[model samples]
Target: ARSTNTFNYATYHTLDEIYDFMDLLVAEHPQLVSKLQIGRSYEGRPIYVLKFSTGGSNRPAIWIDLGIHSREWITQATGVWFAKKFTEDYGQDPSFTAILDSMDIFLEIVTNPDGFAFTHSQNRLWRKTRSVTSSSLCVGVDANRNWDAGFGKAGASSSPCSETYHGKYANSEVEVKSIVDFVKDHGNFKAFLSIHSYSQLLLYPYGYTTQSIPDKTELNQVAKSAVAALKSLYGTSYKYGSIITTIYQASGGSIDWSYNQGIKYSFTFELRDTGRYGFLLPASQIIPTAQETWLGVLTIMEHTVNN
Candidate 1:
């Protein structure tokens, strides 16, 4: 539409609507925002990153991506609300204003556009990329399970039909590779946060191995603070720890890759619900979820900026 003012963050939206929202958002906040096409999806849809910087050249950054699983509509909705909130808070929120003045934020709302579109059109539960396997009848690769850290390992499946199928090779999926390239090239990301849904957990890295991270104590404390901030808002309880400890071993996850790359603040958030509504979370809860999630995210950003 004419402005982001008319966009409905409460409801789920299609890929095109989100792309349009990015265009409108950058146009409205030219001084503090810009859009970058990192790469195209498997279906040729452009992959976009919203760069929120208040006039610094490649400053220390924080990477936040949402909805890589496609069916987790709440994460995407929270991302849209986040985009709008960034514009609204620049000068109004003192903490955020200071962070933007020195640190850049790179937010990718739809990490898997093809699968996201497929979720809307075909199956509401699509959680992989829409690329056809060599000759297999099954379609798409698990973007989360396609990363390079401990890739093709025990936790992920060899079968292409499985939910956590590691792709043909590490960085095989263009969707995952695009993010890898962008982050590697930038080389200054202080924090990397991948957002997903339905567990209400704040997890740090080492999902590929049972081994403890060197800075586990630091990240454990950080995750505790983030969950605390989130809980203070809606009385939402979140269990926090390493991914493997909190959940189970999951190979080739985004946080593991980021942590291995020396991004000490890498974390993954499984947002909202203990699973009554699950991925089909109601539209009415969008604002509350996004609002509390924002506090957790902002708490992380504050930590990154200081350290």
Candidate 2:
């Protein structure tokens, strides 16, 4: 099934259709699936998190999130694919079966619901979550940049209109608050993977600045190994390092915050082409993109459980 990233069968689904799809998924598989109202977006759209596992509570969970930036539709779609593959194909596939039987996977598919909807409905390139600020003409905050760790520091902007705007204060957006609360409540989480797109790189923590994490060696070792696995899948080479070293200096990112909160295997996966189509990655690429990502994630899952 691994081929080109672009295909004619890919469908560009709207927000309402996506919501219906998720609702149907939970309704269809109530036994291994549970939906949660993590919180509401600035526009009052409910941010939903779907927990999929054979059992609940104290299962040494892994937290995976997607679509924090509205324009990153691949992030959201890849997450949905991961959930469906595990739940639908677990019995048919040995790897899926092993993952389900071993650990709990908490999939927060859309972290910025309002922003995602806005991107589909209004602006095609909208990045930040919808949060009205007191300054300038811009009205949203980059939720990834609003995390409490190193908030408004290097690689984050104080201005409200910028793409990497940190917001008026840390956790100023309701979505950020929701994630923080979820992590706190689900204390047994072993690893975190936040999905994004258009960079095709595997990134780790300390995104707030150029400073490296205390566990830099350990993080790089795990990340490099994962990237190598991804390469084997389709010969896709991904540059791997801490956020600052690999991608750019980004502040208050989700993986960075999770790492600081004691999650050792936190990572941010930037999927697919390196801005070939920019934010508008063609639908055909979704499956191959997801396939590559799955390889990397599987590598991480195996390593995390063993270590």
Candidate 3:
């Protein structure tokens, strides 16, 4: 049955369904939420971001993007829950109310629209943007590895056929470029969070190289606190550290790029079960995952607002 409650956090949703949910949110909270069409995807689909602000112009913001890999269904599902949560908690929760009163939150629920749609219609595990390569027959680029922080460096693939292909050039994917431009133009983002799924990790920067970030101590401590808050909800443990040390060497990551751009609280969340279900996580676990993930994200936002 089609869900009449678009804000239901317990089930997975299609691309159109999520888009419709965005409209529903905006309609419901006209003063608190507004939709922004940042750019169109490679497939010409409109890429939307929901901007939540109480009453601010050019405020220091917290930037969050999910579903960049397309196959990370949980991230998008959590995003919907988060959008609804923002509306519910803003005037009610003291900490959240203070944060919203001073800062803005830009939530890009479906960052890679084309790839996301492809995951639903064709391949369930498609992880790249649906942009075709010129010299090769392979299609799409690993959007996560297509950022400008460590373009064409280690931990990404040169071959277009590889799942980790970094693309011909940094910001080669329009979806990536759109965000880069938008954030750069805004110029006041205090934190940047890119949420992905499976593995249950809370990571900070320096994914492209082994050299530690100058703010390593601060970021590391914040990660620890955030993970602790997350575990408190449902005892879902998460390892916290630099991307290279915690997980593996990952170059050209969004968090790396945002950190270099002076967004000090940059982090990436790898959510839910650690490879037990992998990308094929059951729908039954959606709400619990979103519920716990919210605590962790809120922890970070609180830190961003304070520091």
Candidate 4:
């Protein structure tokens, strides 16, 4: 499709379709949006991140990634919608326009391209990167669990075949490492947000350990207001708290790694229905989910720009 407007954001898309959408979006708004091939996935598919800037050298930025867990269709679909929203709201919405005027936004829609493709072709529930180890018969590693924070600690599986398997070591998977490298080089990211599904929760930091993040009070308040912003649109309820306290312990999570790196506004979102549809969320709910999610995410972006 020559225009992203021709793309369907209400339904799930395969790896190639999302990639094409990124290209078309960049072409549609060359000044504000551009596609960057950060690195290749395990299967040699090029991974891309969309850069949205109103023109800055390396402005303090917000990092948003979706589909790190391949089975979460809602996150990826919401991501596509978000890409379009950036273009639509840039000169129109005062809040979004102000944020973009000061800071850049980096968005990666298909975080696990290989596993995303596998979810389309082979298994609809594949939730990891398709990187096989020589000794293990298992096909992939959970990309979320492959980060450097609290590596191989509790909350991750040692068994290769386990769905929550952490790779041989931290940053072992190329998909995860590519993000680490890019973020490190960028150096001025004020916020890091990782998008996931079900549960309808917003969380921040220290899932690997029982210890609380230093900015717990501020983070909690931000999450509270963010969830409130989310509820304003669709009245979709969401619980918010520390990841270890709200959800379970999850080592090597993206937000945890980002938080450790001094990104004070790092957060992770588990979006939409609690369990009715789970990962197989209907395409029908895609727009509603994205619209509500944009409110909450935009809330955080506003905070990131100001503080």
Q: What is the lDDT of residue 93 in candidate 1?
A: 96
Worst 10 residues of 2 by lDDT: 1-10
The per-model lDDT (C-alpha) reads 0.92, 0.81, 0.92, 0.92
Q: What's the TM for model 2?
A: 0.93
Off by over 4 Å in 2: 1-9
Q: How accurate is candidate 2 locally (lDDT)?
A: 0.81
True lDDT of residue 113, candidate 4: 88
In model 3, where is the ten-residue run with the lowest total lDDT?
A: 1-10
Residues 237-273, model 1: lDDT tens digits: 9999998988888898999999999999999999889
Q: Which parts of model 3 are misplaced by more than 4 Å?
A: 1-7
Cα lDDT of model 1 overall?
A: 0.92
lDDT of model 4 at position 202: 96
Cα lDDT of candidate 3 equals 0.92
Clashing residue pairs in candidate 1, if any? none
lDDT of 4 by residue, 202-288 (tens): 999889999999999999999999999999998999999988998899898899999999999999999989999999999999999
> What TM-score fits each model?
0.99, 0.93, 0.98, 0.99
Q: In candidate 3, what are the lDDT values of residues 23-133, reduced to their tens digit?
A: 888888899999999999998999899999988689999999999999999999999999988998988999999999999999999999999999999999999998995
